[PDB]
Amino acid sequence: RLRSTPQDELHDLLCVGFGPASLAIAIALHDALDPRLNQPKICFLERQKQFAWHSGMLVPGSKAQISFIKDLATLRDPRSSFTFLNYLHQKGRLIHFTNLSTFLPARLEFEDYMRWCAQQFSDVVAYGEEVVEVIPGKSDPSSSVVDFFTVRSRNVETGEISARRTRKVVIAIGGTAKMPSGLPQDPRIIHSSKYCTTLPALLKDKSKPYNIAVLGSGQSAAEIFHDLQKRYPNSRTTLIMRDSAMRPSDDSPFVNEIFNPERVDKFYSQSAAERQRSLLADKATNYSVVRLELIEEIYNDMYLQRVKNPDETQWQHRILPERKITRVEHHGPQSRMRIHLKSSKPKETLEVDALMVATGYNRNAHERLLSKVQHLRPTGQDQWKPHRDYRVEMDPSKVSSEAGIWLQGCNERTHGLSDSLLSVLAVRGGEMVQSIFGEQLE
Amino acid sequence: RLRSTPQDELHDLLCVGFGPASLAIAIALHDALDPRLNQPKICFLERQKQFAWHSGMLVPGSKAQISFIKDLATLRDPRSSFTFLNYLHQKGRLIHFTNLSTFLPARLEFEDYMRWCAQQFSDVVAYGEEVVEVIPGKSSVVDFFTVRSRNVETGEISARRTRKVVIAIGGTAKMPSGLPQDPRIIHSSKYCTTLPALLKDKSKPYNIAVLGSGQSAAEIFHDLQKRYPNSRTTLIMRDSAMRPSDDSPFVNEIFNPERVDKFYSQSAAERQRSLLADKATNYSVVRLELIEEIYNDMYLQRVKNPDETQWQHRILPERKITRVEHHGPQSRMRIHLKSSKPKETLEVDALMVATGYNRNAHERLLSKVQHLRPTGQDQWKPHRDYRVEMDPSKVSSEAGIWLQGCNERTHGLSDSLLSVLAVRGGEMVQSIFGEQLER
Amino acid sequence: RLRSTPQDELHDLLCVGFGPASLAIAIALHDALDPRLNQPKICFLERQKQFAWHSGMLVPGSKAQISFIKDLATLRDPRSSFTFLNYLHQKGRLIHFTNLSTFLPARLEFEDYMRWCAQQFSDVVAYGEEVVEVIPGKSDPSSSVVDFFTVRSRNVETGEISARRTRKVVIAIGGTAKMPSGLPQDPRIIHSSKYCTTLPALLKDKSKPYNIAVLGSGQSAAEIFHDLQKRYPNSRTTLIMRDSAMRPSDDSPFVNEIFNPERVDKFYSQSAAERQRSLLADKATNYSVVRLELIEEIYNDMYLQRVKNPDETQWQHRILPERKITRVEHHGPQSRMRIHLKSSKPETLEVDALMVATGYNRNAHERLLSKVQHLRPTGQDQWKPHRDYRVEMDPSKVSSEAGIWLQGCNERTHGLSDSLLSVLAVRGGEMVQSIFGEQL
């Protein structure tokens, strides 16, 4: 029902990335066009070759960390055909999911749900295209204002650069792997985001006695550490964390009301200081914390080792708390790197075949992608500043009001902790369609 | 969308009862007429003064016993505007329910959801109307029916004519035989409505007994201890213990909508064997969490006094009532108990009788048309699409009677529940209005 | 502490079997002898080479099915040195177990607890001894009265027969594998009791796409079916059950009071008709049922196959309900047997192994005592235990100071707890008073 736009025509909207955030916009646009519920020239560019939701971390048994009611449509309109329940119905799996009695689908299943949603937009999604730059465009070269943008993308397979012109741009590119600055670059040092996809290529013998270290103590680290013990049953795994313990995520109901869609207005209207203080107070809802059930499972596995041998130093799988990595030796043809550990308080060494670095993500890559348009920001800004409707501030003497750039998923500091999650995507997709296409549709 | 039909015209369909079962049919009819998703002369008669879902058993804290996904539309079409989630959304309560993390809404909430659904059919529902007779209408062929109802407020008898009749009247209170008639002997279905009128002083040390060991008995026994803090309650059961309901996932696939075809297609012997094999999913069983809470309350009494006979609240297992003696409202009733194997006397202010329900009241209601059944039948026989067998030499092809909610023997344990209402509603609309709608 | 008796001497008590039931008797006799809580010529004969608790079913992740308070001593005396909590304390593990917040230890752990208890009685337990018969003894050439028994056992390693004389015998030999009669004998057909110990030797390549069927739908079937899926991650497993579904065990509190030690008195005093009707009413506590958590786990694995493929005939792991095996072709050099399946209401599989999880019988004491069954009173075809677990003997034939007790095979007279760990602590205490009371 959403038709393609010729690559070389002037688009109304180009979205960089086709993860859940952009997909929720495609769904909301489809729904806003659906006569049952209530065409712009739109495309989406995605570097991956097909839709995939953190495929590097699709570990067996991993569960979504959101109730399925927070899918890409229900909180905006439960009648939408893009709800998780309607997806199940179309797959003939609705009653079977009902008998599961869980709000938390397997990540594999929620990925498939979103894949099923995305498949209905394949005519307007360009996969295998990595946006590399956004550059100013002027319909009249001697005009003093930019009135469109040219987005250049690199073909992930051939490296060819393609160009699309558009009035409006959405940046919804998720996060980039955050790595500790003192770790060297090495094929054996692998960020959590590439665990399932690259670690098997590196360590091909599942039964070989590898020594595998995991750095971190949030959800990525816990899932990898737990999974490694099953994926390489004879390995020796070491969880290295600078905290004293894995800590539980806060799933409690009053605290989690910060994720309600209608809280975005209130959070945004707060002073930067109150926003800073609020984000700090609620950081334990998602960051550096592990779902209690997974902590308890790991704790149980540790206990079973203790039953077999009371000396923890002799355990197959170990946790080294309050440690930090001070040096990595990684040169020469040998298989193992040497990891140097010191206390994380204000030496030990491990020989490892691979280091999984589960140290989280940054959400600042939009600043790099937009560097060739950052001269259009108002003087005195060194970061893009989104308004309540996610449109970034532009110097009006330099940019036409009909052109604009919106950010999605990197606005935690202005819009709250729900900004990078699935939590408010259904509602926000509806807001973005109104903001970007409201006049056009009316 | 569904418009009234004048009281005197020949209706296409008249449904007796407007509980969840008839409501699901109205919803599916609405949805089949809704252009987003893809008029017959229909009305409903309901004895209660408004839609109400077992209002006598709306005890504080009671939860519906079905995942909300099994609401009145979602399993048929999750896009329907009559889903529970859409209901929550229209109330501005969707996110708040989400933060609850339960599939099992409070019964008060699920009633309100269904009441919200029912309010959309107010033009075609006549409340406060108790159907009393279904009369043959006419050659020697019966081709319509007259449904007579008594107004609960005025007692006036009204007649409505219809080609087709749906009987969806739920169940009637099953009482142990031989009980005297006494207003203080109260079936569980009237607990919230009759006991507070009878026992008005919440702080008085009443003696209150409860008969039974299913979900109704447990809920009443647990609730009495909070409603009458100073009461002495006694749970009388002929089994040895409250037993947990089976919510295990493979067993509970018997409630799937698509199992109705498979169950129906079995022999009567296999259907009987199946119903007995799965009886622990719902009958004479208690949700484990409630069993454990009652058990904890009992243990705490043991902490205060090791002598169980001196407890405020007691359970008398493996007992049956041999008689309830009364000497007038001047004094307490005397309950005589003996072992239920193939003794005690209790003096009580009230007896709550939580002994379940029968689902055969339709045979009385249809007695004046039972001569239209095929010779040699003493019970109405519903087919897979719920239409009862009629002697075709006596009844026209344009007329018929359907039963809903009383067909466990032919359609499985889900028949009397909410479990398959969304899907069954769609089937009923097809079977009843399919041709009409295709034209 | 418990000192050995010279093997050729006349013992006060010989217990056949050193599983938890005999062990609980050893522990209770130790405690009765400790002046700090409050010696007979006692010995135990055990077939296995060391103490082991259903080692053939020590499946990874398996948990005990009793609260640890129901251990071998606590319910009789929480001060006993043989409580699970003291065992943990002696191991330096008490605080660490406490942080688990569970009442159900891993079976591997509970076995090690009982093994730790057992090792304290090594002086009176002879391992590797399979008792083969109990023969009557008449110490008076004039009197025709049996006043002792000679228990003969076959040494598992040497096959040599040895004889021990005792006034009193306890038979505590647990259960024998119950196999469907129509099933042929074949090395690829293994009872669940030999799963961990026999199946790996038969199916040695953990990564081969084997076809493995499991017969049954109780706790053993579910544990094996779920375990096979991790052990042989490429196998195609099939759960064959004659019921329509796996059904949850009843762990609800009022029902499980049937397992209370003080209930044995009330159960025993009932008519055989009521005791039969009671056992059938409460069979769901533990027979032909699966702990709910494990049912849901299996169901979730099944659901995940449905996500990837809607057609269940094509799943890697399948459940076939309401089926019975009518025939198993197993002759031939072919690696796989052919299981023929019909409906169980009143298709063929090609498999490399059939795990048979069809439960146990507790009738083996009948063969062991055949050479003394003539000492029973006239008109009994079964041994009839009294409340104190002593079997009835014709008093004109057996001296009062001689007797035979049965342990763990008395469900019919003593309740569903009889074969479990449930009342072992208290029953041990009663057995020591029944057997050694007068002597103490």
Next chain:
Amino acid sequence: LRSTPQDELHDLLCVGFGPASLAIAIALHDALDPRLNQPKICFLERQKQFAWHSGMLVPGSKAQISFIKDLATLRDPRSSFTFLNYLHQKGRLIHFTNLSTFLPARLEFEDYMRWCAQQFSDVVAYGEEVVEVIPGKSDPSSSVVDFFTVRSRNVETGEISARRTRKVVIAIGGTAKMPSGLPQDPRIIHSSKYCTTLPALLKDKSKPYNIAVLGSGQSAAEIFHDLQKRYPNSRTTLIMRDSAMRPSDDSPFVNEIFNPERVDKFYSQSAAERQRSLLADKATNYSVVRLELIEEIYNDMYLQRVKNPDETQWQHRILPERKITRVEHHGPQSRMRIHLKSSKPKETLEVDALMVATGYNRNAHERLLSKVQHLRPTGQDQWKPHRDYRVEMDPSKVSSEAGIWLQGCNERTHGLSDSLLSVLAVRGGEMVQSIFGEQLE
């Protein structure tokens, strides 16, 4: 354990007979028991019998410790003072087993400890409120203090009596912490006196009282939840300066800080490391609520929303991010007027009672020891307990046979478990060794 005449020189006098002092009595009994392995000992307790926070024994409240952490098991599971042995003596062991819970009702755990305490009745004097600890010199002309005189007030008569002892244990728990700007008024009641004092004030269970609760930790949540059941027609208001009730951390790795053997590890860290560690782990106990109770309160709120979507009209409300700026409480009117402002760096409530669930202080031992604090080493203004809980004394002023020990107020040096039931069994054994080790050997 047999009585020592009040006027004799004791070996040990314990101030308080709560769980901490009882753990020492139990460990002394066990050390004296030949099955497991007399000093002149005396306990002084203000209450008339053993009682474990009886002011907060609200219906349904649970102990927040696995029963394995009782007063003896972690030191010796064979002790007759274990929780399981108590159940066995009550004829209740199997029944508790069928509960499948590690967390007894507070009522039950209190009864267990009362059952333990009754076996020490000969050495506990109830109804005695200790008021001061005074230096003693068996030779008044000498310059060294070699005993202490403990003075207590009889609660019934008010008479002071004196007991002399070589060694003193202070194990007095905590005192109610009140916000300083709140006035003193019979309608303003600390959570510790909820069950004992609020019913006396509000006698009519059916009256539609307006009752506010200040705070958002476990006491505030338990009271807020209880009031809705005790006064079914009341309007209750939970006033908190946080934005939400937050869950307590019961995850297993974090909760290893409560292990007995971790006391050595915590104590052996630098003061800065101890401060940082205590702050990191505050969510295990302080200003947090057991998740299950939070979920129950949230569900009760949800039901109100079903009946009426406008939260201002709800019977029971939560006012987050608020602070009390003024209380009007003079005049004959029954209700006080509470003034609220944002807690961020006008609105009024009229209430019949304000329950103040703002926690406890643990400095009351400093008052009791004021008349001996000149015996500390020069340059100390706070008591410094060593690893074995004995406070530092100037050795040139105090004899080695005299000493003062503290229990339950030593979080800063010994960890979060110090004020709880967590390490009492093991610590009792350590305290018996330190105080009576030579004497018993």
